[PDB]
Design a protein around this nucleic acid. Sequence first.
DNA 1: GCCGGTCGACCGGC
DNA 2: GCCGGTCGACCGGC
Lengths: 251, 257
Amino acid sequence: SFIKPIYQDINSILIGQKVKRSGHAAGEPFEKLVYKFLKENLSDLTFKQYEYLNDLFMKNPAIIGHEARYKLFNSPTLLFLLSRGKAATENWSIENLFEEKQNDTADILLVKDQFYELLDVKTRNISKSAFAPNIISAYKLAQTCAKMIDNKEFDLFDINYLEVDWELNGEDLVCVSTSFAELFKSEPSELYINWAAAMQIQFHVRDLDQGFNGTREEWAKSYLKHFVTQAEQRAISMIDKFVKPFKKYIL
Amino acid sequence: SFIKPIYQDINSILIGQKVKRPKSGTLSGHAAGEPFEKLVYKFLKENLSDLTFKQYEYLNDLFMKNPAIIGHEARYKLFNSPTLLFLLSRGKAATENWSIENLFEEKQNDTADILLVKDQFYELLDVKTRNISKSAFAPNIISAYKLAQTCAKMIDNKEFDLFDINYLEVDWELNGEDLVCVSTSFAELFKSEPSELYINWAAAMQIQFHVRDLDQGFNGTREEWAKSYLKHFVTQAEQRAISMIDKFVKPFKKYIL
DNA sequence: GCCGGTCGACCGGC
DNA sequence: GCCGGTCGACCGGC
Ligand SMILES: [Ca+2]
Ligand SMILES: [Ca+2]
């Protein structure tokens, strides 16, 4: 992780900051200032996901078309996580340019020497009761592991997280704490997948275990086994909860 | 419906009207067009003053009027309906801790947007906003499961004339600096054919549609609508259980077996 | 045209 | 302590 090192400096620079308004339930602007720090202390590595695609496309003008522009990622896995649709890629131009999209996998992307660090910022209102937030689609992760195994890409990227905790005074959100964690350092089989919540894995960054000791490959195989098993159980529990209880009303 | 009777008015006072573009610079999300929503509510507060409440306001008023009723148990009786209670209540502890100095505030997952109530009849209104130029992805309308529980309670308690669940969409267009209201739409969930409702299971098990497209040609009873929807919900839940297997299990076995 | 997966957080029941 | 449902939007591959 390129963020692990300066973490603490970013922790200390974040505590005290204030973003304006928990009615709308969004401490999202905190993401912006984390980027503010990273863009200064780590200039040539920090990219907003859309900013990175603009760059990859701007440094290869002779290359156009959705088919060729996709080849530029040189990784089916990286391609899957960061690329945009065919038309969006077919239509991209130095005059059109990608903007930010609600669907992007990561908030900030740190690249350096063919290596990527997908950073996703999480914001928690620590005043309220603990409720694990969506982290990432468990299905997206599933497909990603499949593509990792298939293509042997086990040293290309990591998916890390930064949890900015905040408290509200009267009319200003103030950061009280921060937390950092790595996805691939956790135990796969113990990642909670909430099927109803957009099949999102859910956990507070401050509570994720970081004791995984196997390899990146073993991680992906373990997770996949976990995913398949939970998928099977979900089907059974969907029957006991959404079918059996409503049988009497059916005639 | 309290809205429909004056829908022509809301529409005839909304069309062409223009409001500022989101300060956030963007143009996507609940943010863009929100002023249109504040406009609709203010119109409602100005013309249906004794019927308009935000969900939390209705609850504050309900408990404020019976200051002698304390404890969630008794406080839950003030609803005089197991169905209404299910749709609007705030939770045991929060109902227990409610006080004239600790009132309810807007909550992210509240069932209703705007409540129009009169003579114990409730209209759960959802005032929505849409950018017809972009917008081509149907939004989450309401949890299919919440509806399922709602219908069961309606059947068990035989409450088929207690409430309606309607929609008021405000379609706008970007005009450089402003937002112009190009049109409005009104639809009633209970005038829709139950089995024609699309339940997106991955999307928080939410029913999804635009409203401008909601079917409004159901001609049966409320009870029928309920039994019918429940039928649709059970059958669709079965399919989904099968789909999951075909989609999330099978294609991944070759990696684990 | 038809279908459905994904981002962002956020309580209350058992 | 611990599990999981709900709100509001959003876009591209068949
Ligand atoms: Ca994020
Ligand atoms: Ca609304």
